[PDB]
PDB file of C-alpha atoms in Angstrom:
ATOM      1  CA  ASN A 863     207.801 126.618 124.086  1.00 13.38           C
ATOM      2  CA  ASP A 864     211.218 128.316 124.672  1.00 14.62           C
ATOM      3  CA  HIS A 865     214.873 127.611 123.745  1.00 16.72           C
ATOM      4  CA  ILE A 866     217.382 125.378 125.680  1.00 16.69           C
ATOM      5  CA  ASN A 867     221.154 125.101 125.556  1.00 16.59           C
ATOM      6  CA  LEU A 868     223.086 122.106 124.341  1.00 17.60           C
ATOM      7  CA  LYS A 869     226.771 121.114 124.736  1.00 17.81           C
ATOM      8  CA  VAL A 870     228.292 118.829 122.030  1.00 20.39           C
ATOM      9  CA  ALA A 871     231.573 117.305 123.109  1.00 17.46           C
ATOM     10  CA  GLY A 872     233.875 115.519 120.818  1.00 15.27           C
ATOM     11  CA  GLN A 873     236.218 112.783 122.000  1.00 16.52           C
ATOM     12  CA  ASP A 874     238.908 115.287 121.260  1.00 15.63           C
ATOM     13  CA  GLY A 875     237.438 117.172 124.221  1.00 14.48           C
ATOM     14  CA  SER A 876     235.720 120.058 122.574  1.00 13.93           C
ATOM     15  CA  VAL A 877     232.393 121.450 123.864  1.00 17.24           C
ATOM     16  CA  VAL A 878     230.428 123.308 121.081  1.00 16.49           C
ATOM     17  CA  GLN A 879     227.487 125.296 122.513  1.00 16.63           C
ATOM     18  CA  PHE A 880     224.000 125.485 120.737  1.00 17.21           C
ATOM     19  CA  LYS A 881     220.737 127.373 121.150  1.00 15.02           C
ATOM     20  CA  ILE A 882     217.562 125.528 120.076  1.00 16.36           C
ATOM     21  CA  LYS A 883     213.774 125.318 120.107  1.00 18.54           C
ATOM     22  CA  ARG A 884     212.972 122.269 122.294  1.00 17.83           C
ATOM     23  CA  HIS A 885     210.777 120.549 119.850  1.00 17.92           C
ATOM     24  CA  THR A 886     212.779 120.667 116.557  1.00 18.45           C
ATOM     25  CA  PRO A 887     214.641 117.708 115.214  1.00 19.34           C
ATOM     26  CA  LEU A 888     218.309 117.483 115.796  1.00 18.47           C
ATOM     27  CA  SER A 889     219.051 117.276 111.993  1.00 19.72           C
ATOM     28  CA  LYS A 890     219.350 121.145 112.098  1.00 18.59           C
ATOM     29  CA  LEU A 891     222.140 120.778 114.730  1.00 15.41           C
ATOM     30  CA  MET A 892     223.876 117.554 113.533  1.00 17.63           C
ATOM     31  CA  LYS A 893     224.467 119.056 110.174  1.00 16.59           C
ATOM     32  CA  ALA A 894     225.451 122.498 111.531  1.00 16.94           C
ATOM     33  CA  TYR A 895     227.928 120.679 113.875  1.00 17.27           C
ATOM     34  CA  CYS A 896     229.418 118.977 110.810  1.00 18.38           C
ATOM     35  CA  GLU A 897     229.600 122.001 108.602  1.00 21.70           C
ATOM     36  CA  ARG A 898     230.897 124.368 111.213  1.00 23.36           C
ATOM     37  CA  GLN A 899     233.820 122.564 113.006  1.00 21.22           C
ATOM     38  CA  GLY A 900     234.113 120.504 109.872  1.00 21.82           C
ATOM     39  CA  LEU A 901     233.361 116.770 110.069  1.00 22.64           C
ATOM     40  CA  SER A 902     232.184 113.840 107.925  1.00 25.44           C
ATOM     41  CA  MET A 903     228.616 112.844 109.127  1.00 25.97           C
ATOM     42  CA  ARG A 904     228.169 109.419 107.659  1.00 27.18           C
ATOM     43  CA  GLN A 905     231.296 108.541 109.775  1.00 27.77           C
ATOM     44  CA  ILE A 906     230.385 109.654 113.293  1.00 25.39           C
ATOM     45  CA  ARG A 907     227.616 108.961 115.888  1.00 28.07           C
ATOM     46  CA  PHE A 908     225.658 110.995 118.320  1.00 29.52           C
ATOM     47  CA  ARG A 909     224.729 109.735 121.814  1.00 30.31           C
ATOM     48  CA  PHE A 910     222.856 111.542 124.738  1.00 30.20           C
ATOM     49  CA  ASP A 911     223.764 109.494 127.710  1.00 29.63           C
ATOM     50  CA  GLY A 912     224.848 106.443 125.690  1.00 28.29           C
ATOM     51  CA  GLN A 913     221.352 106.415 124.116  1.00 28.58           C
ATOM     52  CA  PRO A 914     221.740 106.886 120.348  1.00 27.29           C
ATOM     53  CA  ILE A 915     220.235 109.951 118.612  1.00 27.10           C
ATOM     54  CA  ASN A 916     218.611 109.862 115.186  1.00 27.77           C
ATOM     55  CA  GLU A 917     217.899 113.013 113.114  1.00 27.70           C
ATOM     56  CA  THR A 918     214.225 112.249 113.644  1.00 29.51           C
ATOM     57  CA  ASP A 919     214.614 112.718 117.502  1.00 30.60           C
ATOM     58  CA  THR A 920     213.775 116.008 119.160  1.00 31.41           C
ATOM     59  CA  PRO A 921     215.060 117.514 122.377  1.00 35.55           C
ATOM     60  CA  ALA A 922     211.801 117.458 124.273  1.00 34.67           C
ATOM     61  CA  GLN A 923     211.223 113.784 123.176  1.00 38.85           C
ATOM     62  CA  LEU A 924     214.659 112.831 124.578  1.00 39.83           C
ATOM     63  CA  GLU A 925     214.207 114.525 128.001  1.00 37.54           C
ATOM     64  CA  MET A 926     217.231 116.738 127.720  1.00 39.18           C
ATOM     65  CA  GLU A 927     217.088 119.877 129.868  1.00 37.74           C
ATOM     66  CA  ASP A 928     219.285 122.856 129.596  1.00 35.38           C
ATOM     67  CA  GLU A 929     223.100 122.606 129.228  1.00 34.66           C
ATOM     68  CA  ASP A 930     222.667 118.877 128.802  1.00 35.50           C
ATOM     69  CA  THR A 931     225.647 117.499 126.882  1.00 36.86           C
ATOM     70  CA  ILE A 932     225.648 115.296 123.845  1.00 38.27           C
ATOM     71  CA  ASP A 933     228.479 112.831 123.166  1.00 34.46           C
ATOM     72  CA  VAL A 934     229.922 112.455 119.586  1.00 34.10           C
ATOM     73  CA  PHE A 935     232.366 109.691 118.529  1.00 40.90           C
ATOM     74  CA  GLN A 936     234.170 108.541 115.450  1.00 36.43           C
ATOM     75  CA  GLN A 937     232.672 105.539 113.770  1.00 33.35           C
ATOM     76  CA  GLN A 938     234.908 102.631 114.944  1.00 36.16           C
ATOM     77  CA  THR A 939     236.189  99.758 112.926  1.00 35.24           C
ATOM     78  CA  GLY A 940     238.386  96.819 113.815  1.00 37.30           C
ATOM     79  CA  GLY A 941     239.329  93.201 113.449  1.00 39.68           C
TER      80      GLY A 941
ATOM     81  CA  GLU B 829     225.014  71.113 114.767  1.00 39.57           C
ATOM     82  CA  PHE B 830     223.829  74.568 114.038  1.00 40.36           C
ATOM     83  CA  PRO B 831     220.746  75.950 112.092  1.00 39.10           C
ATOM     84  CA  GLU B 832     220.776  75.336 108.315  1.00 39.61           C
ATOM     85  CA  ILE B 833     220.940  78.182 105.902  1.00 40.82           C
ATOM     86  CA  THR B 834     217.903  77.893 103.677  1.00 41.14           C
ATOM     87  CA  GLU B 835     217.042  78.926 100.163  1.00 41.93           C
ATOM     88  CA  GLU B 836     215.263  81.955 101.721  1.00 43.35           C
ATOM     89  CA  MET B 837     218.325  83.158 103.569  1.00 45.28           C
ATOM     90  CA  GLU B 838     220.982  82.941 100.825  1.00 44.00           C
ATOM     91  CA  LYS B 839     218.760  84.847  98.419  1.00 42.65           C
ATOM     92  CA  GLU B 840     217.967  87.542 101.029  1.00 43.93           C
ATOM     93  CA  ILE B 841     221.572  87.793 102.137  1.00 44.26           C
ATOM     94  CA  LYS B 842     223.253  87.775  98.702  1.00 44.10           C
ATOM     95  CA  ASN B 843     220.885  90.533  97.759  1.00 40.93           C
ATOM     96  CA  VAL B 844     221.802  92.880 100.604  1.00 38.51           C
ATOM     97  CA  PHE B 845     225.485  92.477  99.843  1.00 40.40           C
ATOM     98  CA  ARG B 846     225.306  93.506  96.200  1.00 38.70           C
ATOM     99  CA  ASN B 847     226.166  97.161  96.305  1.00 38.13           C
ATOM    100  CA  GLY B 848     223.405  99.820  95.571  1.00 37.13           C
ATOM    101  CA  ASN B 849     222.829 102.851  97.573  1.00 33.80           C
ATOM    102  CA  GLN B 850     224.746 102.403 100.889  1.00 29.18           C
ATOM    103  CA  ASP B 851     222.537 104.981 102.663  1.00 28.50           C
ATOM    104  CA  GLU B 852     219.411 102.730 102.333  1.00 27.53           C
ATOM    105  CA  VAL B 853     217.949 102.233 105.844  1.00 25.00           C
ATOM    106  CA  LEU B 854     217.182  98.481 106.039  1.00 24.74           C
ATOM    107  CA  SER B 855     216.446  97.659 109.796  1.00 21.84           C
ATOM    108  CA  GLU B 856     215.599  99.936 112.666  1.00 17.72           C
ATOM    109  CA  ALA B 857     215.725  98.437 116.204  1.00 17.48           C
ATOM    110  CA  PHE B 858     216.981  99.631 119.597  1.00 17.87           C
ATOM    111  CA  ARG B 859     216.994 103.200 118.284  1.00 18.14           C
ATOM    112  CA  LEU B 860     219.770 101.896 116.076  1.00 14.09           C
ATOM    113  CA  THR B 861     219.778 101.891 112.310  1.00 16.19           C
ATOM    114  CA  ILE B 862     221.193  99.406 109.858  1.00 15.15           C
ATOM    115  CA  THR B 863     222.112 100.514 106.465  1.00 13.81           C
ATOM    116  CA  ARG B 864     223.565  98.614 103.409  1.00 12.17           C
ATOM    117  CA  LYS B 865     226.726 100.365 104.384  1.00 12.66           C
ATOM    118  CA  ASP B 866     226.547  99.113 107.943  1.00 17.03           C
ATOM    119  CA  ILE B 867     225.518  95.592 106.779  1.00 18.32           C
ATOM    120  CA  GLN B 868     228.253  95.390 104.136  1.00 19.93           C
ATOM    121  CA  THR B 869     230.811  94.946 107.001  1.00 20.81           C
ATOM    122  CA  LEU B 870     229.783  91.260 107.172  1.00 21.89           C
ATOM    123  CA  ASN B 871     230.614  90.255 103.711  1.00 21.80           C
ATOM    124  CA  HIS B 872     233.722  88.112 102.994  1.00 22.21           C
ATOM    125  CA  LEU B 873     236.351  89.243 105.505  1.00 23.93           C
ATOM    126  CA  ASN B 874     235.527  92.968 106.198  1.00 24.89           C
ATOM    127  CA  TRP B 875     236.037  94.944 109.349  1.00 22.79           C
ATOM    128  CA  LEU B 876     232.981  94.888 111.517  1.00 21.49           C
ATOM    129  CA  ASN B 877     231.764  98.436 112.202  1.00 23.87           C
ATOM    130  CA  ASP B 878     230.275  99.632 115.497  1.00 25.91           C
ATOM    131  CA  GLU B 879     226.610  99.502 114.370  1.00 28.82           C
ATOM    132  CA  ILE B 880     226.683  95.789 113.764  1.00 27.60           C
ATOM    133  CA  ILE B 881     228.067  95.035 117.185  1.00 28.26           C
ATOM    134  CA  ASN B 882     225.849  97.288 119.261  1.00 30.60           C
ATOM    135  CA  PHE B 883     222.849  95.756 117.442  1.00 29.80           C
ATOM    136  CA  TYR B 884     224.023  92.226 118.088  1.00 33.19           C
ATOM    137  CA  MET B 885     224.903  93.156 121.650  1.00 34.09           C
ATOM    138  CA  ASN B 886     221.376  94.408 121.911  1.00 35.25           C
ATOM    139  CA  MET B 887     219.782  91.245 120.618  1.00 39.72           C
ATOM    140  CA  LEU B 888     222.000  89.392 123.039  1.00 35.51           C
ATOM    141  CA  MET B 889     220.569  91.536 125.746  1.00 33.50           C
ATOM    142  CA  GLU B 890     217.022  90.947 124.549  1.00 32.54           C
ATOM    143  CA  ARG B 891     217.456  87.190 124.275  1.00 34.42           C
ATOM    144  CA  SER B 892     218.293  87.461 127.990  1.00 34.77           C
ATOM    145  CA  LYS B 893     215.046  87.753 130.158  1.00 31.28           C
ATOM    146  CA  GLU B 894     214.183  84.607 128.384  1.00 29.16           C
ATOM    147  CA  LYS B 895     213.419  82.066 131.077  1.00 30.51           C
ATOM    148  CA  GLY B 896     216.390  80.113 132.358  1.00 30.77           C
ATOM    149  CA  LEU B 897     219.011  82.443 130.864  1.00 29.58           C
ATOM    150  CA  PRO B 898     221.447  84.826 132.803  1.00 26.72           C
ATOM    151  CA  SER B 899     219.884  88.191 132.518  1.00 24.69           C
ATOM    152  CA  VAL B 900     222.227  90.638 130.703  1.00 25.41           C
ATOM    153  CA  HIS B 901     222.709  94.366 130.430  1.00 24.65           C
ATOM    154  CA  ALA B 902     225.092  95.021 127.529  1.00 23.92           C
ATOM    155  CA  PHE B 903     226.911  98.266 127.184  1.00 23.62           C
ATOM    156  CA  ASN B 904     227.394 100.719 124.409  1.00 23.83           C
ATOM    157  CA  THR B 905     230.706 100.265 122.446  1.00 22.28           C
ATOM    158  CA  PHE B 906     231.816 103.851 122.964  1.00 18.35           C
ATOM    159  CA  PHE B 907     231.332 103.196 126.726  1.00 18.15           C
ATOM    160  CA  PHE B 908     234.552 101.411 127.569  1.00 18.36           C
ATOM    161  CA  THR B 909     236.954 103.923 126.044  1.00 16.01           C
ATOM    162  CA  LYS B 910     234.997 106.994 127.155  1.00 14.29           C
ATOM    163  CA  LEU B 911     235.407 105.739 130.708  1.00 12.63           C
ATOM    164  CA  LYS B 912     238.987 104.607 130.096  1.00 13.36           C
ATOM    165  CA  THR B 913     239.962 108.086 128.600  1.00 15.70           C
ATOM    166  CA  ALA B 914     237.518 110.579 130.307  1.00 14.09           C
ATOM    167  CA  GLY B 915     236.765 108.729 133.596  1.00 12.49           C
ATOM    168  CA  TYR B 916     233.592 107.877 135.419  1.00 14.08           C
ATOM    169  CA  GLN B 917     232.300 111.299 135.794  1.00 14.05           C
ATOM    170  CA  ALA B 918     231.639 111.284 132.019  1.00  8.80           C
ATOM    171  CA  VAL B 919     229.844 107.905 131.663  1.00 10.76           C
ATOM    172  CA  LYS B 920     228.020 108.508 135.057  1.00 10.32           C
ATOM    173  CA  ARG B 921     224.649 109.382 133.595  1.00  8.45           C
ATOM    174  CA  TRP B 922     224.740 106.610 130.973  1.00 11.79           C
ATOM    175  CA  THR B 923     223.199 104.158 133.463  1.00 12.34           C
ATOM    176  CA  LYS B 924     220.435 106.330 134.817  1.00 11.09           C
ATOM    177  CA  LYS B 925     217.295 104.262 134.603  1.00 10.39           C
ATOM    178  CA  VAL B 926     219.124 100.853 134.786  1.00 10.56           C
ATOM    179  CA  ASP B 927     220.375  99.083 137.954  1.00 15.44           C
ATOM    180  CA  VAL B 928     223.575  97.513 136.627  1.00 12.61           C
ATOM    181  CA  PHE B 929     223.408  95.048 139.522  1.00 16.01           C
ATOM    182  CA  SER B 930     219.881  93.890 138.677  1.00 17.24           C
ATOM    183  CA  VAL B 931     221.356  91.641 135.907  1.00 14.91           C
ATOM    184  CA  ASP B 932     223.469  88.497 136.190  1.00 17.58           C
ATOM    185  CA  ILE B 933     225.844  89.657 133.471  1.00 15.38           C
ATOM    186  CA  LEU B 934     227.292  92.846 132.032  1.00 16.93           C
ATOM    187  CA  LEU B 935     228.510  92.818 128.488  1.00 19.70           C
ATOM    188  CA  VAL B 936     231.438  95.127 127.462  1.00 18.39           C
ATOM    189  CA  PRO B 937     232.323  95.438 123.814  1.00 14.99           C
ATOM    190  CA  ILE B 938     235.781  97.162 123.587  1.00 15.50           C
ATOM    191  CA  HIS B 939     237.315  99.117 120.754  1.00 14.11           C
ATOM    192  CA  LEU B 940     241.058  99.790 120.930  1.00 13.91           C
ATOM    193  CA  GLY B 941     242.470 101.416 117.769  1.00 12.45           C
ATOM    194  CA  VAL B 942     242.844  98.444 115.405  1.00  9.08           C
ATOM    195  CA  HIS B 943     241.008  95.955 117.603  1.00  8.93           C
ATOM    196  CA  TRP B 944     237.692  94.455 118.788  1.00  8.65           C
ATOM    197  CA  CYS B 945     237.661  92.729 122.174  1.00  7.92           C
ATOM    198  CA  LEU B 946     235.270  91.812 124.962  1.00  7.17           C
ATOM    199  CA  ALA B 947     235.014  92.141 128.710  1.00  8.53           C
ATOM    200  CA  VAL B 948     232.424  90.246 130.771  1.00  7.02           C
ATOM    201  CA  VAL B 949     231.265  91.159 134.355  1.00  6.34           C
ATOM    202  CA  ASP B 950     229.735  88.050 135.761  1.00  8.74           C
ATOM    203  CA  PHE B 951     228.189  88.805 139.282  1.00  9.29           C
ATOM    204  CA  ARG B 952     227.187  85.130 139.619  1.00  6.94           C
ATOM    205  CA  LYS B 953     230.725  83.952 139.077  1.00  5.89           C
ATOM    206  CA  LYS B 954     232.047  87.056 140.952  1.00  5.16           C
ATOM    207  CA  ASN B 955     234.719  87.558 138.367  1.00  7.53           C
ATOM    208  CA  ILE B 956     235.605  89.832 135.387  1.00  6.80           C
ATOM    209  CA  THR B 957     237.081  88.277 132.294  1.00 10.56           C
ATOM    210  CA  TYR B 958     238.632  89.876 129.167  1.00  9.12           C
ATOM    211  CA  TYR B 959     238.467  88.174 125.793  1.00  6.72           C
ATOM    212  CA  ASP B 960     240.954  88.640 123.075  1.00  5.64           C
ATOM    213  CA  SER B 961     240.340  86.548 119.877  1.00  3.93           C
ATOM    214  CA  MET B 962     244.070  86.914 119.214  1.00  4.27           C
ATOM    215  CA  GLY B 963     244.999  85.892 122.784  1.00  4.71           C
ATOM    216  CA  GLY B 964     246.326  89.301 123.716  1.00  6.18           C
ATOM    217  CA  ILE B 965     246.290  90.288 127.345  1.00  5.41           C
ATOM    218  CA  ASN B 966     244.374  93.192 129.015  1.00  3.13           C
ATOM    219  CA  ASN B 967     244.752  92.881 132.754  1.00  2.05           C
ATOM    220  CA  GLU B 968     244.162  96.583 132.963  1.00  2.00           C
ATOM    221  CA  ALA B 969     240.765  96.548 131.402  1.00  2.00           C
ATOM    222  CA  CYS B 970     239.273  94.676 134.375  1.00  2.00           C
ATOM    223  CA  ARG B 971     240.943  96.984 136.785  1.00  2.00           C
ATOM    224  CA  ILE B 972     239.111  99.865 135.052  1.00  2.00           C
ATOM    225  CA  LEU B 973     235.796  98.060 135.135  1.00  2.71           C
ATOM    226  CA  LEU B 974     236.132  96.908 138.756  1.00  4.71           C
ATOM    227  CA  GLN B 975     236.689 100.716 139.448  1.00  4.86           C
ATOM    228  CA  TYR B 976     233.559 101.543 137.477  1.00  2.00           C
ATOM    229  CA  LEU B 977     231.553  99.075 139.647  1.00  2.00           C
ATOM    230  CA  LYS B 978     233.044 100.686 142.822  1.00  2.42           C
ATOM    231  CA  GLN B 979     231.901 104.210 141.594  1.00  2.00           C
ATOM    232  CA  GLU B 980     228.600 103.213 140.171  1.00  2.00           C
ATOM    233  CA  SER B 981     227.710 101.474 143.481  1.00  2.00           C
ATOM    234  CA  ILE B 982     228.290 104.777 145.333  1.00  2.00           C
ATOM    235  CA  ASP B 983     226.515 107.007 142.720  1.00  2.00           C
ATOM    236  CA  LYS B 984     223.421 104.788 142.381  1.00  2.00           C
ATOM    237  CA  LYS B 985     223.017 102.564 145.395  1.00  2.00           C
ATOM    238  CA  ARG B 986     224.756 105.047 147.823  1.00  2.00           C
ATOM    239  CA  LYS B 987     226.908 102.315 149.361  1.00  2.00           C
ATOM    240  CA  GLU B 988     230.328 100.867 148.543  1.00  2.00           C
ATOM    241  CA  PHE B 989     230.858  97.801 146.497  1.00  2.00           C
ATOM    242  CA  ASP B 990     231.960  94.478 147.976  1.00  2.00           C
ATOM    243  CA  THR B 991     235.374  93.909 146.409  1.00  2.00           C
ATOM    244  CA  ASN B 992     235.807  90.689 148.443  1.00  2.00           C
ATOM    245  CA  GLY B 993     236.133  87.390 146.528  1.00  2.00           C
ATOM    246  CA  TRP B 994     236.281  89.066 143.030  1.00  2.00           C
ATOM    247  CA  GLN B 995     238.628  87.691 140.447  1.00  2.00           C
ATOM    248  CA  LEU B 996     239.952  89.626 137.420  1.00  2.00           C
ATOM    249  CA  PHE B 997     241.760  88.105 134.517  1.00  2.00           C
ATOM    250  CA  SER B 998     242.105  87.992 130.704  1.00  2.00           C
ATOM    251  CA  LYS B 999     241.752  84.542 128.804  1.00  2.00           C
ATOM    252  CA  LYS B1000     244.934  82.694 127.630  1.00  2.00           C
ATOM    253  CA  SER B1001     245.791  82.280 123.966  1.00  2.00           C
ATOM    254  CA  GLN B1002     244.753  78.598 123.972  1.00  2.00           C
ATOM    255  CA  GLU B1003     242.050  78.769 126.720  1.00  2.00           C
ATOM    256  CA  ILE B1004     239.569  79.868 124.060  1.00  2.00           C
ATOM    257  CA  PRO B1005     239.645  79.790 120.175  1.00  2.00           C
ATOM    258  CA  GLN B1006     241.897  81.872 117.898  1.00  2.00           C
ATOM    259  CA  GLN B1007     241.208  83.841 114.822  1.00  2.00           C
ATOM    260  CA  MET B1008     243.315  83.063 111.732  1.00  2.00           C
ATOM    261  CA  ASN B1009     242.643  86.256 109.789  1.00  2.00           C
ATOM    262  CA  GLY B1010     242.863  90.018 110.486  1.00  2.00           C
ATOM    263  CA  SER B1011     239.139  90.781 110.502  1.00  2.00           C
ATOM    264  CA  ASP B1012     237.320  88.242 112.630  1.00  2.00           C
ATOM    265  CA  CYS B1013     237.694  89.998 116.000  1.00  2.00           C
ATOM    266  CA  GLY B1014     234.194  91.537 116.155  1.00  2.00           C
ATOM    267  CA  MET B1015     233.068  88.230 114.843  1.00  2.00           C
ATOM    268  CA  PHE B1016     234.732  86.222 117.634  1.00  2.00           C
ATOM    269  CA  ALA B1017     233.900  88.993 120.077  1.00  2.00           C
ATOM    270  CA  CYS B1018     230.180  88.811 119.204  1.00  2.00           C
ATOM    271  CA  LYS B1019     229.980  85.063 118.975  1.00  2.00           C
ATOM    272  CA  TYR B1020     232.135  84.980 122.142  1.00  2.00           C
ATOM    273  CA  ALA B1021     229.370  86.864 123.988  1.00  2.00           C
ATOM    274  CA  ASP B1022     226.496  85.014 122.444  1.00  2.00           C
ATOM    275  CA  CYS B1023     227.952  81.708 123.594  1.00  2.00           C
ATOM    276  CA  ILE B1024     228.545  83.112 127.140  1.00  2.00           C
ATOM    277  CA  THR B1025     225.091  84.542 127.564  1.00  2.00           C
ATOM    278  CA  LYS B1026     223.595  81.092 126.721  1.00  2.00           C
ATOM    279  CA  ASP B1027     225.835  79.583 129.504  1.00  2.00           C
ATOM    280  CA  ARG B1028     226.999  77.450 126.664  1.00  2.00           C
ATOM    281  CA  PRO B1029     230.665  76.578 126.530  1.00  2.00           C
ATOM    282  CA  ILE B1030     232.654  77.966 123.587  1.00  2.00           C
ATOM    283  CA  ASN B1031     232.121  75.686 120.518  1.00  2.00           C
ATOM    284  CA  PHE B1032     233.107  77.720 117.439  1.00  2.00           C
ATOM    285  CA  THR B1033     236.511  78.161 115.778  1.00  2.00           C
ATOM    286  CA  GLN B1034     237.648  79.911 112.624  1.00  2.00           C
ATOM    287  CA  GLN B1035     235.921  77.082 110.645  1.00  2.00           C
ATOM    288  CA  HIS B1036     232.433  78.428 111.612  1.00  2.00           C
ATOM    289  CA  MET B1037     233.219  82.029 111.052  1.00  2.00           C
ATOM    290  CA  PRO B1038     232.141  82.303 107.393  1.00  2.00           C
ATOM    291  CA  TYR B1039     228.907  80.645 108.431  1.00  2.00           C
ATOM    292  CA  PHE B1040     228.427  82.819 111.443  1.00  2.00           C
ATOM    293  CA  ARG B1041     229.020  85.818 109.221  1.00  2.00           C
ATOM    294  CA  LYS B1042     226.240  84.838 106.924  1.00  2.00           C
ATOM    295  CA  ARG B1043     224.005  83.824 109.825  1.00  2.00           C
ATOM    296  CA  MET B1044     224.464  87.082 111.607  1.00  2.00           C
ATOM    297  CA  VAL B1045     223.236  89.075 108.649  1.00  2.00           C
ATOM    298  CA  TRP B1046     219.853  87.328 108.780  1.00  2.00           C
ATOM    299  CA  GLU B1047     219.794  87.660 112.595  1.00  2.00           C
ATOM    300  CA  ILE B1048     220.298  91.329 112.252  1.00  2.00           C
ATOM    301  CA  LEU B1049     217.621  92.360 109.714  1.00  2.00           C
ATOM    302  CA  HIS B1050     214.921  89.989 110.960  1.00  2.00           C
ATOM    303  CA  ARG B1051     215.954  90.788 114.683  1.00  2.00           C
ATOM    304  CA  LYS B1052     216.106  87.071 115.869  1.00  2.00           C
ATOM    305  CA  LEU B1053     218.926  84.858 117.030  1.00  2.00           C
ATOM    306  CA  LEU B1054     219.418  81.306 116.013  1.00  2.00           C
TER     307      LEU B1054
END
């Protein structure tokens, strides 16, 4: 059940490519994306097509195909 | 003339505020997650984080489809700006599997640096309206949205949008209520929308904000609006 490619784009405009088994949770990636290309974690959010992504979630069970892109934004606070 | 806050509520709420492991996951709905951290933003006069809004905007959307209420599709928070800054081509796919024209109202929660604000597409009224709780203007926001509609129409329905008759404007400083603190934007913004989605005219002022803060808490965890 082979690998697929995934683009993670920051709202600073930075694509970070990733290989992955299609059934594994996105915890592996989300924490790799924080460590490499250093970033908080408990201060961002991930969203495949405006749909939120929890660590639980897998690629297969989100219907992402190859080269599909994931959006990642800072946490947002305001008045 | 609003719901009372019972013994039950106070005791539950007060408990969730008292700090103790902010990672604790204490409400999972709409693929969203609400932690003690997320929920803390409602205490006293804190700054409403994104999670609380998205969640509330989801309940607002759920409480649509209720008989005799304008059907609402509410948007992501990160929507507005990702469009504003990166254009349509970016947010394009965000509305796959949802006809944005199937509903009566679209709900747009907006984050701008320091600020929470709201934009409301009302197909029935055929006008777009921006809502600052501090009466600040954003004529431009609407222009951007109307442009979205234009694009969306072509990308989904494969026809152009009927611009004709449509109004765009932000609401005056005294047309609606004003916030007297620095933190009650997301609070106005949320209650602003609630009020609307019920076709209810705006009732609430600053007065009712402390109460609405409490009440929102309950509404979140239990996933039910009052």
